[PDB]
Amino acid sequence: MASFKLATDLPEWKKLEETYKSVGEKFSVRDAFAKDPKRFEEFSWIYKNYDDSKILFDFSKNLVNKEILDQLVTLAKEAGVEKLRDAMFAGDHINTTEDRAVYHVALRNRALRKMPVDGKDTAQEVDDVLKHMKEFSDSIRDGSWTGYTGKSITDVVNIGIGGSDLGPVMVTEALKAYSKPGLNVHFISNIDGTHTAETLKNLNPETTLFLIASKTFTTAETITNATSAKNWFLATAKDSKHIAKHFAALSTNEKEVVAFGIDAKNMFGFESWVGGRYSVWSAIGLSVAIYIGFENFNDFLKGAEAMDQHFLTTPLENNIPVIGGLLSVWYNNFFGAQTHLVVPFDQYLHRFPAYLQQLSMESNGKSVTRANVFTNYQTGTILFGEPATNAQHSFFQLVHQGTKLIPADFILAAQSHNPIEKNLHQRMLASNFFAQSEALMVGKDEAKVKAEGATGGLVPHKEFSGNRPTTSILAQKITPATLGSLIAYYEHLTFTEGAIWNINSFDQWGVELGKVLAKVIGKELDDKKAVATHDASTNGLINQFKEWEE
Amino acid sequence: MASFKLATDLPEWKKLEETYKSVGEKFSVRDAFAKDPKRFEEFSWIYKNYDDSKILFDFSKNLVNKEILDQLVTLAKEAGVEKLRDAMFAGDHINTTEDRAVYHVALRNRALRKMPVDGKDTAQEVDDVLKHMKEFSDSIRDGSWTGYTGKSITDVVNIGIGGSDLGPVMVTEALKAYSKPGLNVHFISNIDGTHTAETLKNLNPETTLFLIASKTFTTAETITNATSAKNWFLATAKDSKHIAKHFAALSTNEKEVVAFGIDAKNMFGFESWVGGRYSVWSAIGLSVAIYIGFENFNDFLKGAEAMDQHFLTTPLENNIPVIGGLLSVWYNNFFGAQTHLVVPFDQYLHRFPAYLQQLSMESNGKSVTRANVFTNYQTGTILFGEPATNAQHSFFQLVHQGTKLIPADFILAAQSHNPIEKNLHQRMLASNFFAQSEALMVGKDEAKVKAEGATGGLVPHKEFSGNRPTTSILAQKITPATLGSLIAYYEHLTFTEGAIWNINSFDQWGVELGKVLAKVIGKELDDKKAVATHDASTNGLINQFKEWEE
Ligand SMILES: O=C(O)[C@@H](O)[C@H](O)[C@H](O)COP(=O)(O)O
Ligand SMILES: O=C(O)[C@@H](O)[C@H](O)[C@H](O)COP(=O)(O)O
Ligand SMILES: Cn1ncc(Br)c1N
């Protein structure tokens, strides 16, 4: 049970409202730097990873100073962020509405600390699944695991949706530099038959391995897609005895895995306390281990574990994911910015914003607190993003000159995996990272536009307000370990936000309802008779579809 | 000049504020359907394309009724939407800040109507470039255009960024069903060297054609990328005279094309009055014509032309793109919703939201009106989206149960290009389309949550408010002509928004700024000497990068 009902009940909340009115609303980052020559030192933090590599988190272009951050930290204290965090790490059932522990942190427990759920250590059970993933992925990669005609596997197809899809997609893309030629990964997720048809169109059943990724192993899209893949496989292989060399499952539900026809030896398990949007660290990440090797996947886990330890052991005022969470609350609830922008200056990370979009919005898009009362304040923001430099040529127009405050995270690796032309492209990429955040902060006033040649009515169109905030995250290199730490950072930033808003960041009753909505209409689409069982729009859409379908 | 200064100066603006307070804020869509037995008929419109195919635009689940819509139409008349539109179609220089015509509508003038810029018809000049595009794309597809060793082309790589990239990407993905095996398209855009390295990895210089796509032919990323591709080509081909069989240009700047070493005969031209984010209809679309054939590209243009004629000739109250734009203004400026969601129930259109994100935000992310004064109201919204059904398992949680109003457009084709398993996947896909908009409207109240078995504090967590608005767009099938009409619909929706806000939807001074920002820091990255020429954050980021760079 909760220690308070609403975030607006916390005494520091109304003090932050007063601080917003007096100094927040018209905050000048320019004046902040002029006042405080040590500003960069004071509002940037270096994170040291377990492998001694480093990530610089620079928050100093944000609309924040010592007064504001001190108040936000007091708010996090009043909200019991530390109490809820420690309960999470203790394995307590802090997912109250499903009565579950929340224990993705136990998935990356490579140190084998005691991490118990229901009083029983999980360390060895998690480690045993990882040992199975290492053995299997090693045998795929070295060719000893052969298909039903005795050939080595060349293509691995993950079939799953949502939390069982986007992690694998984003991480295999982000770590693609660590893959091997001739071993490729693919992803079927959408129920839209296009996804099945286009993915399988040029694959060979004799050299294709399927991972059916599903926590429940009952999701309509996934089971239907898995059935279509099994039918495609059997069209060439004929005998169901051969499925055991070509189909594995990533799941919590062994009974449904076996009933679908997958051997239990080919099941890689996890537990109910792994949320789908927190699941890439589990058996769900098997496609990652196959694509880049288990050791790289293990280094990915160890990066998350090192960020977990930072989150667990650091006083709030120097706790990097807490600081990031506090700034989001500041913008969302006091400035009323509804969105947050994430821009990787990194092409490999092109699906990173989409992954954070699920993690953030599915966690914190809630309207009821842990006191089981409705909120009267904003919760989760809308997250969006695309890679730079592309984004600089498109919606950055609105980030620079529109009428909406859009807090933004920019991410750059100091070193490229592809340093072509003696780093000519990389230096250009980095120069854009620095110059864009600079320009959003400094802007361009009326006098400078005039000095640059504009006259008359053109002048205001070319002005830039400045004081548009960014966080810059500079890594040395986007290694597996660095990516692990970066995702965990955003996991714990999300945790911090949710704790302040007093919501359950770990259920998803809107996604759960969606999984049961479509069946009734699906039955109505089986016969061609007109329908009048819904509202007039739903009827009209269905009936127009029936007239236009095949 | 402008006929008014600010949108808040239009008399209907204050009336819409009164209507928002009295009818809008607490609008019940459930009540609306109960009150109006003809609501679906009254708030849905069937668009008929030039080829007699049809698209149903169903707005009836929006927070709108006859009174509200009639006031929005009156606002559109006061704003002179029609006068600005007619000026656009007449070739007038309505891009005031750059003193340019805005004539993407002339690109798809396949009827060869008289469409003059500066008093001179553009019809034959546009048609001549399309004739060149047909000739060249025909020769690529039939194998008669051969590489420098006499082989037919198997791979086409577009090199460009922003408006010279995203349309070609999105449309080739969207119309992929119309491609043929053995002729593939690829896209280099990011300056990040990863994009060059990974795209050229498996390609053969002997059979690869490059299209250098740049309106100006001076953009730093694109010319740098184009130089790298030329270096890659020449590392195998050795002789620069081979460039003429492997490099073409899509540009307005012939002198810079020729200076780069591309034969003028290999240039596909267009004019200054084609904005990048409106350019896929021009020579910029050459990759589309190559990938799917010129006649399909031409049908795509003809679908846009038909939607143009709808927009041009239809009174406002039945004008489909106008209605879409008026609703956006209603949500943005009276409900205060900062975002707009676009969800294609269609895997081929997975890049459609990203394309609209550029179209929308780069057009309408502006703070100054055509009277050259700053706005005192919100302008362009933040657009985002992913295809369904994937979106239903992730950020739809927030759409259903968060604290933010998120107006949403759902798009579905009644017929799939891949109707596998006797349309089993397609019927499931369709059922989710109907069920999701239905659930967002009807919700689930406390009594039903209790009837479904929840008790005590769990109940509020499983409630859904309903009255969350959607627009449903149902096409017969996403053909080239359908996609052409769909993009043009959103172009003219964006038009209508910007005309009411009285902004210039067709310049982009923040994008123009971005392309001149990085050079100063780029020259400082030629050294590893520490820099102190900027603010302390920019200095600190640059100096930390120098310490960590390779
Ligand atoms: O976030 C979620 O809970 C969803 O996206 C699930 O991951 C998705 O519905 C698939 O569920 P499952 O893994 O049980 O097949
Ligand atoms: O919308 C825009 O204007 C930009 O995205 C441009 O398309 C981009 O900067 C590329 O410019 P160009 O076509 O001149 O190379
Ligand atoms: C506010 N925010 N930004 C990134 C992420 Br993940 C969240 N929750």
Ligand SMILES: Cn1ncc(Br)c1N
């Ligand atoms: C508001 N809106 N929705 C889609 C697009 Br393109 C715009 N401008």
